[PDB]
């Protein structure tokens, strides 16, 4: 089997992407944030504290003839950005782009933090990291990908995120028309439960490539590119007036600037992030100070190849017995 679904930016900055997901019988379609940095499929629901729901579409398990309470199971998650959610668990039928999994754990939120409430466009998350990170207790549950894998034509999914435009998540096949050149594959460590890999270096603009190993995660659920302070300083030093602002929480730059590109290495191959992808607009409405899309990972504890990086590529998440990651230009 295969599936193919369009993923759409939630706003004009590509802060996140939502993909429609069918849950239950009859289908209830929710727009979920596909997140290769976590492993829980959780939704706003009829059980979510009413004051914490503000415009989201909810899953109502009592209206699904295929929903079953997973007795005794609870979940609770905290994300790198400080947001969180928790609740109980149903199993139900879940379909993405024509690909159907029966018996998928659907984690129903009883509580969500303010960041989720305040974002009306995201009805929940669909985790695509390794199932070892799933938070369901006392019986850990599998991700949608893990459940689908054996049925897929090939045990892969691909992320093709757009810049200020829709893109695609495919399951079970590689669309050879969706990228240019060849796909370069690189080793993955699953030791921390992430799609963790090592970039071979970077360049800033038309500058020379610096060969250096950068361990990090491919994370569709993180907006920005978080890299070591040395790398980030070298990037922003090429933008007149750019500075790290402790009050804003990262590098800012004059909105009048033209940003240089940023290149990262995948083996001997190179992915080029155009400068415009690195512009996240005014820090507050009407400001002429703009927020940078490349930020320091210092104090996160891990480097993160988030949407800023991934949207410059066609990315293969290969879930073969030994997982690997593939990147192509597009």
Swiss-Prot record:
Organism superkingdom: Eukaryota
Alphabetized UniProt keyword annotations: Aspartyl protease, Disulfide bond, Hydrolase, Protease, Signal, Zymogen
Catalytic activity as recorded in UniProt: Hydrolysis of proteins with specificity similar to that of pepsin A, prefers hydrophobic residues at P1 and P1', but does not cleave 14-Ala-|-Leu-15 in the B chain of insulin or Z-Glu-Tyr. Clots milk
Domain Peptidase A1 intervals: 17-328
Enzyme class, first EC level, given as a word: hydrolase
Disulfide bridges in this chain: 255-290
Catalytic residues, chain numbering: 35, 199
Gene Ontology terms: biological process: proteolysis
EC number(s) from the headed UniProt entry: 3.4.23.22
Keyword DNA damage on entry: no
GO molecular function: aspartic-type endopeptidase activity
Recorded family membership: Belongs to the peptidase A1 family.
Designated name of the protein: Endothiapepsin
Residues of the full protein shown: 90 to 419 of 419
